[PDB]
Design a protein around this ligand. Structure first.
Ligand code: PRO
Ligand code: PRO
Ligand code: PRO
Ligand code: PRO
Lengths: 272, 272, 268, 268
């Protein structure tokens, strides 16, 4: 358990999907890494190979060599495949390498057993990694150090925001930050549909819906205010806003979003 | 109707509230122009005076003089006060001066009648101007030129996004981009409450809710995809996301947000 | 490997579905009636003979003379029919089941080999607009799959899917037509409620549904984008869409598919 | 009589609908491009020229050279366009409006005669599956009606109805497609909710809806009878139907048609 060189470490991606690509592009764009310090492996796909080569990253032909040449290894293969991929690589997963999983649903306990050591970090990002606005959370294996954690905070700080949480919260986090985008995509469509129902042109309605939601969320993220206080700031007496809010409350809007989160968290638990 | 000098115009703020401050700071930050080209008038308030002076803007003691010395005049007084303010200034509101109103609910027809001419532009921003992510729309008076329009698009561009729309759409716009932030503030709180209901710590739940909403909206604003396609991208077969979406649909979630927009638009129309 | 242009096809079970597949294959020229065989009912006999197909008197002989065998007997009877024919079901013969609810695992065990394809069509086979899905046994080849794609392309559209999805498919493409029959009737009733004559209302409802689905199948657009294209500002379409959304219309159709899939699973 | 086999057709308004009609009429051989003429975008010129149709530079000349004239300009513009052309709108020329919301009474007053037919198509014209209805001006002949049935039979189906029904028709065939687009999406979402892949779920949802509607349009059966045909005892289909009925599904689609019809009436 030698510390990972903060400025000079090499990063290996096992699994070359969208999420790996988003992390690699983000890390390069923000200067956390240069492409020469990143490796990935691809077998079947010439298209995925292009995506990585086109940003200056060397694509090797085996997972084995990616691991050998990497200080930090990020596993992003489909969850059902991960176990076998880890077991295959096990002899090369020496304790001087920091391992990271972004696989949905795979608990720390299992990651550590498969790898045979506890220098492992688990990250659950979400779909907004693509535009650098992910909501990510990380949990630490029993041998992951504070310096390991900071290294991974910096890496994933390049695709959005990142927080720390106990592994036991990850089902619930899945129902909120993992699944929540889709609740907001519905909301944006419905707002647009509402604008059209009130007489707006479709393109304007949709533009305004998206940006209105973006704006409100930015107010929430930056203002340091409770959401109740933000709602109080825009609800003028007997005005348009409070009329709309009242309809939401009549229908139990808040409860409906609570139910979604809860059901999704419950499904996450059931999928084990 | 001489064109406004694009590089050398002077700007006057009648009404020195948060919205005027935001536009002024933004314009200066982004280099659209220097504080020396900007004037505002304040009577009662030494605190509002500080806010403007502290960014290098000269505060005069009368509205009359602000207008005299300005090519472009932005009215941001409370809507109920606007009519009387305009009527008082009317002799000074000559056709060579481009007028702009950010007042909620005041129609172009009325602006033009009060001012006695048609070189008037109406801008309806929303509350996210504070963090530079406003959803704004502009309508043009009968004598406002394309160049006038561009001058305003550029002036305002510091506070968010701006779209052009007929004045007749503005009641409805109020129900969507004006009032919509409060719908999202409810949504953020409800998502947080949902996370806590599923076992998450409050601070994490709130941080995730806000950033999950921000991320989704960013995906919608940048991706070029229909919201339905974005939802389809994140709904894995039999997964957590679709379970949550299903609860939203069972409850008529989209129809509720439509009802809010429509009721708010209806209230806007009733408030005249 | 089955001869692509000269194979013979045998139908075990001579019901509506087998008739539809036979007629479709002939109409479209995939097959000539002389290349088709099938095996109490004089009326069913007529249906096959009337399109030029030879009706034999035993299942055994249909199998002997066929490269490809399609089983369309009632599901509860299939096991015994297959076990009876087993000695004749040699590996050079591609077997196909259209039986509702019978898993690939079971088909393969009954036959004693894995050169088996499962197809689940739906009721619209009758008018050549079936929504069908196929799963492949462990020894079914790509060429076997293409042969069956071509055969069932003659009665509608066909897609590939893992056998494990077949319960859920049943709740969507199997059961979905009924959801649409209710919708057509309710649309007609709606037209009448708004003052239209009944015959017109019904004609419009059916052809409106047909037209919309054709737009969906051919446009390459997401349904949401299609809905956006027709929803004029403050117009008639959006007013109607708003009533749907107030009532949770989407959710109700999701519930139907989910409950039907759950029932399919329970029926094993 | 308009010459049934040799008439020339003129499009005043060169939007999507006019393009769909022109392409349909050509594809099906009702017309050759040389027998069609049209007269706001240099891009729209390409769309018509690219299928062999001559674009003229004035509405006046389109009319002069046409036996049959189809008005597809935006409804608010139609009155002024007709009034401008009035001296050229002689009684030997059959006039047609596809403009939403414009009553026969008004069309006839603007044109100064009653040899006018009104057609309300819907969005599925683009794929040749429109649901259209026509009403006849006081001087439109049976032969005029047949000519227009044939023309619009090239973009889907067409029925006759009194002008007074056109608000309600709008709520049903005009607005209905969107109801179906929501249905298709919801059925796909339902499939995914039951475990299906998205692409398969969507493909199946669209084709299932297309198939069902084809059964309705071709079978000659009442929708209730078609629902009875697919609802097996205690099976998957009836479990899904039951969920629909628990929620009042039929009523919701009735509400949509009614509210849309009401809005059409309000938009005058
Ligand atoms: O609550 C209201 O009426 C004002 C107007 C839109 C934004 N807030
Ligand atoms: O739907 C699912 O299961 C995955 C996990 C969260 C986002 N998509
Ligand atoms: O939404 C509307 O008003 C138009 C007319 C029917 C189809 N779309
Ligand atoms: O209702 C049932 O169970 C069968 C299966 C789908 C079509 N009808």
């Amino acid at each position: 358990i030698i510390p990972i060189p903060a400025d000079s470490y090499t990063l290996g991606f096992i699994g070359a999907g969208k999420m790996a690509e988003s992390i690699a592009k983000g890390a390069v764009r923000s200067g956390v890494l240069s492409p020469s310090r990143i490796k990935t492996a691809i077998h079947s796909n010439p298209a995925r190979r292009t995506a990585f080569e086109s940003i200056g990253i060397t694509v090797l032909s085996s997972n084995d060599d990616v691991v050998r040449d990497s200080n930090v290894v990020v596993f992003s293969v489909k969850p059902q495949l991960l176990k076998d991929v880890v077991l295959k690589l096990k002899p090369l997963l020496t304790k001087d390498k920091l391992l990271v999983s972004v696989a949905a649903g795979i608990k720390m306990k299992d990651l550590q057993e498969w790898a045979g050591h506890e220098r492992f970090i688990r990250v659950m990002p979400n779909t907004a990694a693509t535009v650098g606005e992910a909501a990510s959370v990380m949990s630490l294996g029993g041998a992951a150090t504070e310096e390991d954690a900071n290294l991974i905070s910096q890496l994933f700080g390049s695709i959005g925001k990142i927080w720390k949480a106990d592994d036991k919260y990850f089902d619930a986090i899945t129902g909120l930050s993992g699944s929540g985008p889709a609740y907001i995509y519905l909301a944006i469509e419905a707002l647009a549909d509402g604008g059209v129902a009130a007489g707006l042109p479709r393109d304007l309605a949709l533009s305004l819906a998206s940006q209105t939601v973006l704006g409100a969320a930015s107010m929430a993220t930056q203002s340091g205010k409770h959401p109740g206080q933000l709602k109080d700031d825009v609800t003028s007496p007997g005005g348009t806003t409070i009329a709309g809010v009242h309809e939401l409350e009549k229908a139990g809007f808040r409860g409906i979003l609570m139910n979604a989160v809860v059901a999704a968290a419950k499904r996450s638990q059931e999928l084990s």
